[PDB]
Ligand binder design. Structure first.
Ligand SMILES: CCCCCCCCCCCCCCCCCC(=O)OC[C@H](COP(=O)([O-])OCC(O)COP(=O)([O-])OC[C@@H](COC(=O)CCCCCCCCCCCCCCCCC)OC(=O)CCCCCCCCCCCCCCCCC)OC(=O)CCCCCCCCCCCCCCCCC
Ligand SMILES: CCCCCCCCCCCCCCCCCC(=O)OC[C@H](COP(=O)([O-])OCC(O)COP(=O)([O-])OC[C@@H](COC(=O)CCCCCCCCCCCCCCCCC)OC(=O)CCCCCCCCCCCCCCCCC)OC(=O)CCCCCCCCCCCCCCCCC
Ligand SMILES: CCCCCCCCCCCCCCCCCC(=O)OC[C@H](COP(=O)([O-])OCC[N+](C)(C)C)OC(=O)CCCCCCCCCCCCCCCCC
Ligand SMILES: CCCCCCCCCCCCCCCCCC(=O)OC[C@H](COP(=O)(O)OCCN)OC(=O)CCCCCCCCCCCCCCCCC
Ligand SMILES: CCCCCCCCCCCCCCCCCC(=O)OC[C@H](COP(=O)(O)OCCN)OC(=O)CCCCCCCCCCCCCCCCC
Ligand SMILES: CCCCCCCCCCCCCCCCCC(=O)OC[C@H](COP(=O)(O)OCCN)OC(=O)CCCCCCCCCCCCCCCCC
Ligand SMILES: CCCCCCCCCCCCCCCCCC(=O)OC[C@H](COP(=O)(O)OCCN)OC(=O)CCCCCCCCCCCCCCCCC
Lengths: 106, 606, 169, 459, 178
C-alpha cells in the first residue's frame, strides 16, 4: 500500500530539512577567500622545448660522453651491415662484388 | 653513438620529470595534465629519432648506464638492451600513451584527483618502458612488478568500490602466479649461467632449457591472461576507461608476449615448449572469442577481443615467428587504444552507461566516434591494407602453411571467424538499429581534447602497420607459394563471420522468444571458470587457513604440546610434592626412610 | 682510461654512405643540429672542468701487498700466521671474483658486438670463459658460507688425492 | 666501539637530570647524534675486520645491526611520546631509561667478540623487554605474554650456556676469531649431535622457529610500540646473528642436522602466511608475517650457502625496517580508534591520504617489491634454496603468493573501501608520527639505492 | 532505501516483485523496444489471467511455479542500471563522500577560507544542540510498552520541533559530491 501518515510527515519534514541543508551547502561569491603569451608555437612550445628538453639533453649528453665512453663496455653496439661493393670508412678496403647471378627470370 | 644513448635516456628523463614536478610542490600553479601530455609528446619525438636511425642502419645497442652492485662473481648493473623490439615498442607506447593522456584530460574532468590519475599513468609508463627496454632480468622484473602494482592501483582507482578492490586483488593474484614462474626462470638462469644478462642467456641457448622455459611460459600466461589465468583481465575492466585502454589493451597485456619474444632463441630450440605454447594460445583465443560472442558490456567485449588477439600472438609464438608476434603487438596496441577511446567517449556521452542493450543510432547521433569505431572494427577483423592486414593475415598464412597441431589450426580459424562475429555484434548493437538510451540527450563530443587523440590513433590504425611493415628489416621468411583457398582464408572467414553475425542479429530483431541453450549460457557466464574457480579455490584456501593453521595448530595443539603441558606437569608435581599434612610424625618417618635409603646407596656404592 | 689489453675490442668497420635516393637524410640533418646545439657547449663545459682539474691536479696510488707465507707452510693453532694467510686468501678470493666479472663482461661484449654471428665469432671468448670457470670450480666451488684457506686447501688436497688415485690406472 | 657505548651510557644521566619539559627533546636529539656517530663503523676500506679492542669489534654483519639499533632508539622515543603524555614524569624517565638500556646492551651484544659475553648480554637484553611489555602493556594478557616470551627464551638459552661452557673447556678461550681459525671437525657422534642441538635451539627459539613461535604473536600484541619494534626489528635478528656466529664450529654434521629445521621453516612460513590471511588482529598479522620472514632467514642460515647468508643479512635489515614501519602504522591506528580489530577501521584512505601512502609503501616493501632490499633478500634466499634442492621453489612460490595476498588484504581492508563514518574521533595526523613513518621509510630507499652495505660477511 | 523492510513480504508484494523482475529480465532478453513491448504485454496478460484467484493456496502454488519458471528462464546477464548494486557506477563515489565531521577537525586557516559556509555550519550545529534533547524525549515517549516495534520513526508532532534522528539523514553526503 501507500505511505502511512507518520512516515509521510517524517519524509516531508526530512526532505524540507534536506532542501535547507543543500541550500546551505552553496558557496558565496567571495568564497574561497584566497590569501607574454605570444602564440603557442613561439612561446608555449618553444619555452618548453628549450627548458625541459634542452638542459636535460645537455646533462644526458655530458653523462653519456664523459661517464660512459670513458668506461670500456658500457655502450656496446653490433657490427653494421657490410655489403658487396661497399667501401669501409675505417679500413679503406672495398668489398669484392658477388657472382654473375645466373637466374634472372624475374 | 652518443646521440642514440642521449635520446634513449632523454626519453627516460622526460618520463621521470613530471613525477618530480608532482612532488616538487608547484602543481597548484601549473596545468599538470597539459604539461604531462606535452612531456609525453616530446618523449615520443625523441623516441622517433632512434626509430629512424635503426630503420636506416639496423644498429643493435647495449647501454650500461649505472653499475648498481658487484656481488662476488655477479654484477647487477642497470642496463638497457636497445632492441628492435625495444625501439619500436617505445615509439608505439609513447604515441599511444600521448593519446590516452589527452583522452584522460578530457574524460577525467570534474574529478578531484585528476593530477593523481595523470601521475599514476606516467608512473605506469615509466615502469612499462623499464620492462620493455631492460637488458637484465632483474631490471625487467622491476618493470614487471612496477607495472603490476600500478595496474592494481589504477584498477582500484575508485577505492570506495568493493568490486574494484576485488578485481584489483585478483589481478594481483594472477600476476603473482606469473611472478612465481618468472622467479623460477630467473633463479634457474642465475644458478646455471651466473647472471641475468641476456648475452649469457644467448650463450645458454645450446643446452636443455626446459625448466626456465616452463617458468617463462607460466610468467607469460599470467601476464597476458591466457587460459587458466584469464579472468583477471575482464575483471580489470572495472577501472576507468583510459586505464582500461592503456593498461589492459595496448601495453601491459603484451608484456608476457614481449618476454617470450625476448627469449625466442631459447624458445626455438625446444619443440615441446613450442607445441604447448601453440596449444595454449589456440585454446585461449578460442575460449575468449566464445566468451566475447555474448557479452553485453562493450568494455568486456573489447577486453575479450584483446585476450583473443593475445591468444593469436601466443599461437604465433608457438610457431617460430616472434617478429610477427611483435608486429601484432604494435598493431593490436594501436587498435585497442583507439577502440577503447571510442567506447569511453560513447560511455561519457551516454552518462556512465556501459552495456550495449541501451545504445543505438550511434551512427547518426555520434558520427565521428562511429566512423572511428568502424575503422577500428574493420581493421581489427583484418580489412586488407589497413594496419591489421600486415600482421594478422601473415599469421593466418603462417599457421595455414607450417606444420602445426590440426585442432589448434581449426580453432584458430574459428576464433578469427568469431572475431568477425563479435566485431559485427559491437557494430550492430551500438552503431545501428533504433535508439535505446534514456531520452535526455547529453551527447557533446565536440571537445578537441576528445577528437585529436582519436584522430592520431585513426592515422595510426590506417597507416602505421603499412609504414612499420615496410620499414621492418627482412627476417622470418614468409611463404607465398600457397593455394588460393589458403591465401584468402582470413578474408573469407572474416566475411563469413560478418554475414553470419548479421543474420543472427536480424534473427534477434525478429519477433520471437527462444529458449536459451547451454552453449549461450556457457558463453555469457564466462565459461563458468570465474564462478567455479573463484568460489572453490578461495574457499578451500581460507577454510584451510582458519580451520587448520591458526585455530588447530597455533591456538590448540602447539599450546597443548609445549607450554600448557609443561605448566600442567609442573603444577601437578608441585601439588603432589607440597600437599604436606604438616605432621612432625610423618616428617620424621620420612627422615627415617631417607636414612635407610642413604645407607642402602652407601652399601651398594662401597 | 681503460686499455684494450684487458678490454679487447675489434676495430670498427663501418661502410661508406652510398645514397641511391635523392631525398635528404633527416638523421644527418638532426645529427648536425645535435652537435651544433648540444655537443659544442657540453665539450666547452667539460674543457673548462678539465682545465680546472689540471690547475688542481692530484695523484693517487694503487696499493700493493707483499706475499705473506701461505697457509701450507703455516702451523696449525699459531693464529698469527693463520690470520695472515687467511686474509691473503680472502684478498685473492676477491681478486678472483673481479677476474670472473672481467671475463663475463668480455663474453657479454663479444655477444653484443657479433649479434647474429655470436655462435661462431665468440668461440675464443666462450673458450676462455669455459676454461676460467673450470678453474674457478676446481678452486672455490662448494666451500660453503664459511669459506676459508683451510677449507680451500682441504678441497684441493681431496681433488689431488682423487686425481692421483685415478692416475694409477 | 667505546665511542658509541659511552655517550649512550651517558644518555641515562641526561634523562634523569633533564627538565620534565626538555627530557624528550634532549634524549631524542642526542640519540640521533648517537646514530650519526654509530654510522662511522661503515668505514671499511679493507677486507680486515674492525677489531677495536680485546673485547669489542665491528664486522660487516655486526655493523648494520648496530646502526639499525642506534637508528631505532630515537624512533622509539618518538613512538613512545604519545601514549605517555598522561603519565608520570618518573615513569616517563624510567621508560626512556629502559629503551636506552636496550640500545646500549644491544650494541654491546652485537659488538662482543666473546660468545659468553654475547650470552650475558643476550638475556641482559631479555630483562628490559620483559619489564617494558609487563609494565606498559595495555591488555590483561601482557603478564602471560611476558611469561611465555621469557620462558621460551630461557629454556632455549640454558642448553646454549651449557654448550658454550663445554666449548670453552674443550678449546680454551671461546674467542670468536680463535674458534674461526682453529675450528676442528666433529666426529658426528651422539654427544656432538646433542651439543649442536644445545647451541642451536636458543637462537631457534629467539628467531622463532615454527612450532615454538607461539610467544611472539601474544608478546607483540600485548607489547607497547617500542617493545614491538625492539622484538620484531632487533631481537629476532639477534638470534639470527647468534646462529651465524655459532654455525662456524659445527661442521660437518650441520649438513644433516639442518634437515628438520629447514622443513619446519618452509612449512611454517606457509602456515603463518595462511594465518595472516585468516587473522583478525593487525598486530597478530604483522607478527605472523615476521615469523614467516624469520623462517626464510632460518632456511637460508641452515642451508649455509654464502648467497643464503647474504640474503639472510639483507632480509634482516629490510624486514626490521619494514616491520617497525608496519607496527608504527598499526599503533597510529590503535591510538586513533582505541582498538586492534583488523576489520573495524576500513576507509582510512579518505581521511588520512599521506598515512595511507605510507601504508602502501610499507606493504609494498613487505610483499617484496623490486628493487628493494626486501626482494633482494627473498630472491637470493630463493636462489640458494633452489640450489640446495630444486623442489623448494614450490614452497617458496606458495609463500610469496600468500605474502602478496595478506599484504594487499591489509591494504584493502584498512585503507580502501567505504569509510566507517561513526569514527568521529579521528584526529588528522601528528607531525610526530608522520615523521616517524618518514624516518622508517627513507633508510629503506637509501639501502635500496646502495645495497652493498648490508651484504654481510660472505660478499 | 528510504523505507525500512518489514518483518515479512506479503503475497501481494512478492507477486509485484516477481512481476518487476520478470519484466526486467524480459527487457534484458528482448533488447529491442517493440519486441519488449510485445512480450511485456504478453506477460501482463498472463498475470491478469492469473489475477483473480480466491483460494490463495492455489495462488501461492502458482506463484511458486511462476518463479520457478523465472529462475529457469532468467538472463545470465540481466540489465543493471549503473547506479544499481552490481552495476558499473555503484559505490563509485564512496571514495569522495567525505563525512561532514572533518570540518570540525579543519584548521582555522581553512575555516577562514570559507567564512559564511562555516558560520552556517555552526548555525546548523546549534540547531542540532537545541533539538537533540527534545527528540530523545519524543523517542522515549512514543516507544510502545509492548515488545513490538518496527524500524520506522515518528515525525515531529508540534511546531518548532524536528523529526527524531534527523542528523544522519539530512546531513548525508551527496551522490555527486564533486
Ligand atoms: C629504476 C627505477 C627503480 C624504482 C622502480 C619502482 C617501481 C615501482 C613504483 C611503485 C610506486 C607506487 C606508488 O604509487 O607510489 C606512490 C607514491 C606517492 O603516493 P601519493 O599518492 O603521491 O602520496 C601523496 C599523498 O597521498 C597525498 O599528498 P599530496 O597529494 O599532497 O602529495 C604531495 C607530494 C609532495 O612530495 C614531497 O613532498 C616529496 C617528499 C620527498 C622530498 C625529498 C627532498 C630531498 C632533497 C635533497 C636535497 O607527496 C608525495 O608525492 C608523496 C610524499 C612522500 C614521498 C616519499 C618518496 C621517497 C622520498 C625519499 C627521499 C630521500 C632523501 C635522501 C636525502 O610515490 C612515491 O613515493 C614516489 C613516486 C614513485 C617512486 C619514484 C619514481 C620511480 C623511480 C624513479 C627512480
Ligand atoms: C650548458 C651547461 C652544460 C652542463 C653539463 C653538465 C655539467 C655538470 O654538472 O657536470 C657535473 C659536475 C662535474 O662532473 P665530473 O666531475 O666529471 O663528475 C665526477 C663525479 O661527480 C664523481 O662522482 P662523485 O662521487 O664525486 O659524485 C657523484 C655522486 C654524488 O653523490 C652524493 O653527493 C651523495 C649523496 C648526497 C645526498 C645529499 C642529500 O653520485 C654517486 O655517487 C651516485 C649517485 C647515484 C644517484 C642515482 C641512484 C639510482 C639508484 C637506482 C636504484 C635501482 C637500481 C636498479 C638496478 C637494476 C639492474 C640490476 O659536477 C658533479 O659531478 C656533481 C654532481 C652532483 C649531483 C647531485 C645530485 C645527486 C646526489
Ligand atoms: C627450547 C628447547 C628445549 C628442548 C630441547 C633442549 C635441548 C636438547 C638438546 C641438548 C640436550 C639437553 C641440554 C644439554 C646441554 C649440553 C649439551 C652437550 O654438551 O652435549 C654434549 C654432552 C656430552 O658431552 P661430551 O661431548 O663430553 O661426551 C663425552 C664424549 N667422550 C666420552 C668421548 C669424551 O651431552 C650431554 O651431556 C647431554 C646430557 C643431557 C641430559 C639432561 C637433559 C635434560 C632435559 C633437557 C631439556 C629440558 C627442557 C625441555 C623440556 C620439555 C619442554 C616441553
Ligand atoms: C634516477 C636515474 C638514476 C640513473 C643512474 C645514476 C646516474 C648518475 C650517475 O651515474 O652518477 C654517478 C656518476 C659518477 O659515477 P662514477 O664516477 O662511475 O663512480 C661511482 C662512484 N661514486 O656521477 C656523474 O656522472 C656526475 C655527473 C652527472 C651529470 C648529470 C646526469 C643526468 C642524466 C642521467 C640520466 C640517467 C637516466 C637513467 C634512467 C634509468 C631509468 C629511470
Ligand atoms: C589444456 C590445459 C589447461 C590447463 C588449465 C590450468 C588451470 C590452472 C589454474 C591456476 C589458478 C587457479 C586458482 C585461481 C584462484 C583465483 C582466486 C581469486 O582471485 O578469486 C577472486 C574471488 C572474487 O572474485 P570474483 O568472484 O571473480 O568476482 C567477484 C566480483 N563481485 O575471490 C577473492 O577475491 C578472494 C580473495 C583472495 C583470498 C585468498 C586466496 C589465496 C590463494 C592461495 C593459493 C595458493 C596456491 C596457488 C597455486 C597456484 C598454481 C598455479
Ligand atoms: C619443535 C621443538 C620442540 C622442542 C622444544 C620444546 C620447548 C620449547 C620451550 C619451552 C617453553 C615453555 C613455556 C612455559 C611457560 C608457559 C606456561 C605458563 O605461562 O604457565 C603459567 C602457569 C601459572 O599461571 P598463573 O599466573 O599462576 O595463573 C594464570 C593467570 N593468573 O604456570 C604453571 O602453572 C606452572 C609453570 C611452571 C614454570 C614453567 C617454565 C619453566 C619450565 C621448566 C622446564 C624444565 C624441564 C626439565 C625438567 C627436568 C627433567 C624432567
Ligand atoms: C619436526 C620434524 C622432525 C622430523 C623431520 C624429518 C626427519 C629428519 C631426519 C634427520 O634429521 O635425519 C638426519 C640424520 C640422518 O642420519 P645420519 O645422517 O646417518 O646420522 C648419523 C648419526 N649417527 O639423523 C640423525 O642423525 C638422527 C638424529 C636426528 C635429529 C634431528 C632433530 C630432531 C628434532 C629436534 C627438535
Amino acid at each position: 500500500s501507500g505511505y502511512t501518515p507518520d512516515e509521510k510527515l517524517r519524509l516531508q519534514q526530512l526532505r524540507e530539512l534536506r532542501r535547507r541543508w543543500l541550500k546551505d551547502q552553496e558557496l558565496s561569491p567571495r568564497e574561497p577567500v584566497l590569501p607574454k603569451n605570444m602564440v603557442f608555437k613561439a612561446y608555449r612550445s618553444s619555452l618548453f622545448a628549450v627548458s625541459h628538453v634542452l638542459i636535460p639533453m645537455w646533462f644526458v649528453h655530458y653523462y653519456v660522453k664523459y661517464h660512459m665512453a670513458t668506461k670500456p663496455y658500457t655502450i656496446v653496439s653490433s657490427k653494421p651491415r657490410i655489403f658487396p661493393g661497399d667501401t669501409i670508412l675505417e679500413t679503406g678496403e672495398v668489398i669484392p662484388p658477388m657472382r654473375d647471378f645466373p637466374d634472372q627470370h624475374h | 653513438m652518443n646521440i642514440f644513448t642521449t635520446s634513449i635516456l632523454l626519453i627516460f628523463i622526460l618520463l621521470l620529470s613530471p613525477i618530480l614536478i608532482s612532488m616538487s610542490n608547484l602543481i597548484k600553479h601549473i596545468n599538470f595534465p597539459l604539461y604531462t601530455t606535452t612531456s609525453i609528446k616530446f618523449s615520443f619525438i625523441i623516441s622517433l629519432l632512434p626509430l629512424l636511425m635503426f630503420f636506416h642502419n639496423n644498429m643493435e645497442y647495449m647501454i650500461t648506464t649505472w653499475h648498481w652492485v658487484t656481488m662476488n662473481s655477479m654484477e647487477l648493473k642497470m642496463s638497457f638492451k636497445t632492441d628492435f623490439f625495444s625501439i619500436l615498442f617505445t615509439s608505439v607506447a609513447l604515441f599511444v600513451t600521448w593519446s590516452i593522456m589527452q583522452f584522460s584530460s578530457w574524460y577525467m574532468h570534474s574529478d578531484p584527483n585528476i593530477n593523481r590519475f595523470i601521475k599514476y599513468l606516467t608512473l605506469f609508463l615509466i615502469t612499462m618502458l623499464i620492462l620493455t627496454s631492460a637488458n637484465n632480468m632483474f631490471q625487467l622484473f622491476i618493470g614487471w612488478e612496477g607495472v603490476g602494482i600500478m595496474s592494481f592501483l589504477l584498477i582500484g582507482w575508485w577505492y570506495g568500490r568493493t568490486d574494484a578492490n576485488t578485481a584489483a586483488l585478483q589481478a594481483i593474484l594472477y600476476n603473482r602466479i606469473g611472478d612465481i614462474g618468472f622467479i623460477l626462470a630467473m633463479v634457474w638462469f642465475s644458478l646455471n649461467m651466473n647472471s641475468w644478462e641476456l648475452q649469457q642467456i644467448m650463450f645458454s641457448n645450446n643446452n636443455d632449457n626446459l625448466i626456465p622455459l616452463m617458468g617463462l611460459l607460466i610468467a607469460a600466461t599470467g601476464k597476458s591472461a591466457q587460459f587458466g589465468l584469464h579472468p583477471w583481465l575482464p575483471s580489470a575492466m572495472e577501472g576507468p576507461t583510459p586505464v582500461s585502454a592503456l593498461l589492459h589493451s595496448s601495453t601491459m597485456v603484451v608484456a608476457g608476449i614481449f618476454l617470450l619474444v625476448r627469449f625466442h632463441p631459447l624458445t626455438t630450440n625446444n619443440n615441446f615448449i613450442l607445441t604447448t605454447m601453440l596449444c595454449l594460445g589456440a585454446l585461449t583465443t578460442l575460449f575468449t572469442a566464445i566468451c566475447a560472442l555474448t557479452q553485453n558490456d562493450i568494455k568486456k567485449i573489447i577486453a575479450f577481443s584483446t585476450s583473443s588477439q593475445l591468444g593469436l600472438m601466443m599461437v604465433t609464438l608457438g610457431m617460430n615467428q616472434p617478429h610477427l608476434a611483435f608486429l601484432h603487438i604494435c598493431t593490436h596496441a594501436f587498435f585497442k587504444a583507439m577502440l577503447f577511446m571510442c567506447s569511453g567517449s560513447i560511455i561519457h556521452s551516454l552518462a556512465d552507461e556501459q552495456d550495449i542493450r541501451k545504445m543505438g543510432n550511434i551512427t547518426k547521433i555520434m558520427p565521428f566516434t562511429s566512423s572511428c569505431l568502424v575503422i577500428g572494427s574493420l581493421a581489427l577483423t583484418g580489412m586488407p591494407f589497413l594496419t591489421g592486414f600486415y600482421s594478422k593475415d601473415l599469421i593466418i598464412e603462417a599457421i595455414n602453411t607450417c606444420n602445426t597441431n590440426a585442432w589448434a589450426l581449426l580453432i584458430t580459424l574459428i576464433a578469427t571467424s568469431m572475431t568477425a562475429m563479435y566485431s559485427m555484434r559491437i557494430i550492430y548493437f551500438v552503431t545501428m538499429t533504433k535508439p535505446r538510451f534514456p531520452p535526455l540527450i547529453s551527447i557533446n563530443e565536440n571537445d578537441p581534447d576528445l577528437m585529436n587523440p582519436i584522430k592520431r590513433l585513426a592515422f595510426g590504425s590506417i597507416f602505421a602497420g603499412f609504414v612499420i611493415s615496410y620499414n621492418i628489416p627482412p627476417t622470418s621468411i614468409p611463404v607465398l607459394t600457397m593455394p588460393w583457398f589458403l591465401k584468402t582464408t582470413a578474408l573469407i572467414i572474416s566475411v563469413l563471420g560478418f554475414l553470419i553475425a548479421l543474420e543472427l542479429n536480424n534473427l534477434t530483431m525478429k519477433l520471437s522468444m527462444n529458449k536459451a541453450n547451454p552453449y549461450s549460457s556457457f558463453s555469457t557466464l564466462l565459461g563458468f571458470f570465474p564462478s567455479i574457480i573463484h568460489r572453490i579455490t578461495p574457499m578451500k584456501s581460507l577454510n584451510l587457513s582458519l580451520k587448520t593453521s591458526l585455530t588447530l595448530l597455533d591456538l590448540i595443539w602447539l599450546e597443548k604440546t609445549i607450554p600448557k603441558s609443561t605448566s600442567t606437569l609442573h603444577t601437578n608435581m608441585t601439588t603432589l610434592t607440597t600437599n604436606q599434612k604438616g605432621l612432625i610424625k610423618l616428617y620424621f618417618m620420612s627422615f627415617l626412610i631417607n636414612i635407610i635409603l642413604i645407607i642402602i646407596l652407601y652399601s651398594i656404592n662401597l | 682510461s681503460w686499455d684494450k689489453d684487458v678490454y679487447p675490442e675489434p676495430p670498427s668497420r663501418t661502410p661508406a654512405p652510398s645514397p641511391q635516393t635523392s631525398l635528404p637524410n633527416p638523421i644527418t640533418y638532426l645529427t648536425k643540429a645535435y652537435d651544433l646545439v648540444v655537443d659544442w657547449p657540453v665539450t666547452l663545459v667539460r674543457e673548462f672542468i678539465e682545465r680546472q682539474h689540471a690547475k688542481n691536479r692530484t695523484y693517487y696510488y694503487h696499493r700493493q701487498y707483499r706475499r705473506v707465507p701461505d697457509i701450507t707452510e703455516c702451523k696449525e693453532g699459531d693464529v698469527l700466521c693463520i690470520y695472515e694467510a687467511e686474509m691473503q686468501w680472502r684478498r685473492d678470493f676477491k681478486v678472483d671474483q673481479e677476474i670472473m666479472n672481467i671475463i663475463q663482461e668480455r663474453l657479454k661484449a663479444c655477444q653484443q658486438r657479433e649479434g647474429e654471428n655470436y655462435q661462431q665469432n665468440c668461440a675464443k671468448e666462450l673458450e676462455q670463459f669455459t676454461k676460467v670457470t673450470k678453474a674457478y670450480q676446481d678452486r672455490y666451488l662448494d666451500l660453503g658460507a664459511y669459506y676459508s684457506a683451510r677449507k680451500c686447501l682441504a678441497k684441493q688436497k681431496q681433488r689431488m688425492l682423487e686425481e692421483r688415485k685415478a692416475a694409477r690406472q | 666501539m667505546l665511542k658509541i657505548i659511552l655517550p649512550s651510557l651517558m644518555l641515562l644521566p641526561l634523562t634523569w637530570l633533564s627538565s620534565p619539559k626538555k627530557t624528550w627533546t634532549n634524549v631524542t636529539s642526542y640519540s640521533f647524534l648517537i646514530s650519526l656517530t654509530s654510522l662511522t663503523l661503515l668505514w671499511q676500506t679493507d677486507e680486515n675486520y674492525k677489531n677495536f679492542s680485546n673485547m669489542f669489534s665491528s664486522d660487516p654483519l655486526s655493523t648494520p645491526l648496530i646502526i639499525l639499533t642506534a637508528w631505532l632508539l630515537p624512533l622509539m622515543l618518538m613512538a613512545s611520546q604519545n601514549h605517555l603524555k598522561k603519565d608520570n614524569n618518573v615513569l616517563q624517565k624510567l621508560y626512556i631509561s629502559m629503551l636506552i638500556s636496550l640500545q646500549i646492551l644491544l650494541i654491546m651484544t652485537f659488538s662482543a667478540t666473546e660468545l659468553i659475553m654475547f650470552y650475558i648480554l643476550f638475556e641482559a637484553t631479555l630483562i628490559p623487554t620483559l619489564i617494558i611489555i609487563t609494565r606498559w602493556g595495555n591488555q590483561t594478557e601482557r603478564l602471560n605474554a611476558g611469561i611465555y616470551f621469557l620462558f621460551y627464551t630461557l629454556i632455549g638459552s640454558i642448553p646454549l650456556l651449557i654448550a658454550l661452557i663445554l666449548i670453552q673447556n674443550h678449546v680454551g678461550t671461546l674467542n670468536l676469531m680463535i674458534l674461526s681459525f682453529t675450528t676442528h671437525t666433529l666426529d658426528a657422534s651422539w654427544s656432538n649431535n646433542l651439543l649442536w642441538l644445545a647451541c642451536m635451539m636458543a637462537f631457534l627459539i629467539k628467531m622463532p622457529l615454527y612450532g615454538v613461535h607461539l610467544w611472539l604473536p601474544k608478546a607483540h600484541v600485548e607489547a607497547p610500540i617500542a617493545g614491538s619494534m625492539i622484538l620484531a626489528a632487533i631481537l629476532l635478528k639477534l638470534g639470527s646473528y647468534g646462529m651465524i656466529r655459532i654455525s662456524i664450529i659445527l661442521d660437518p654434521l650441520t649438513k644433516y642436522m639442518a634437515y628438520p629445521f629447514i622443513l619446519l621453516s618452509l612449512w611454517g612460513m606457509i602456515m603463518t602466511s595462511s594465518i595472516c590471511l585468516r587473522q583478525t588482529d593487525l598486530k597478530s598479522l604483522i607478527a605472523y608475517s615476521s615469523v614467516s620472514h624469520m623462517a626464510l632467514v632460518i632456511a637460508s642460515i641452515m642451508i649455509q650457502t654464502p648467497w643464503s647468508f647474504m640474503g639472510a643479512t639483507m632480509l634482516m635489515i629490510a624486514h626490521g625496517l619494514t616491520s617497525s614501519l608496519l607496527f608504527c602504522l598499526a599503533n597510529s591506528n590503535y591510538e586513533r580508534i582505541h582498538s586492534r580489530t583488523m576489520i573495524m577501521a576500513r576507509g582510512l584512505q579518505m581521511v588520512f591520504p599521506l598515512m595511507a601512502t605510507w601504508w602502501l609503501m610499507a606493504s609494498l616493501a613487505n610483499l617484496a617489491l623490486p628493487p628493494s632490499i626486501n626482494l633482494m633478500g627473498e630472491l637470493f634466499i630463493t636462489m640458494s634454496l633452489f640450489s640446495w634442492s630444486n623442489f623448494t621453489i614450490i614452497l617458496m612460490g606458495i609463500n610469496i603468493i600468500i605474502t602478496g595476498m595478506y599484504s594487499m588484504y591489509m591494504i584493502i581492508t584498512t585503507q580502501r573501501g567505504k569509510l566507517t563514518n561513526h569514527m568521529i574521533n579521528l584526529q588528522p595526523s601528528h607531525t610526530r608520527e608522520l615523521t616517524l613513518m618518514a624516518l622508517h621509510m627513507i633508510p629503506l630507499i637509501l639501502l635500496t639505492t646502495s645495497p652493498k652495505l648490508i651484504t654481510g660477511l660472505t660478499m | 532505501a528510504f523505507c525500512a523492510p518489514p518483518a515479512y513480504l506479503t503475497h501481494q508484494q512478492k507477486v509485484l516483485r516477481l512481476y518487476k523482475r520478470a519484466l526486467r529480465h524480459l527487457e534484458s532478453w528482448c533488447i529491442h523496444r517493440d519486441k519488449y513491448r510485445y512480450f511485456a504485454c504478453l506477460m501482463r496478460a498472463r498475470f491478469e489471467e492469473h489475477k483473480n484467484e480466491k483460494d490463495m493456496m492455489r495462488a501461492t502454488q502458482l506463484l511458486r511455479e511462476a518463479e520457478e519458471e523465472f529462475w529457469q528462464n532468467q538472463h545470465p546477464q540481466p540489465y543493471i542500471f549503473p547506479d544499481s548494486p552490481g552495476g558499473t557506477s555503484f559505490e563509485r563515489y564512496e571514495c569522495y563522500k567525505v563525512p561532514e565531521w572533518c570540518l570540525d577537525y579543519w584548521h582555522p586557516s581553512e575555516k577562514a577560507m570559507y567564512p559564511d559556509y562555516f558560520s552556517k555550519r555552526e548555525q546548523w550545529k546549534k540547531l542540532r544542540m537545541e533539538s537533540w534533547d527534545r527528540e530523545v524525549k519524543q523517542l522515549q515517549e512514543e516507544t510502545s510498552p509492548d515488545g513490538i516495534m518496527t524500524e520506522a520513526l515518528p515525525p515531529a508532532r508540534r511546531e518548532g520541533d524536528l523529526p527524531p534522528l534527523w542528523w544522519h539523514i539530512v546531513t548525508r553526503p551527496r551522490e555527486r559530491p564533486t
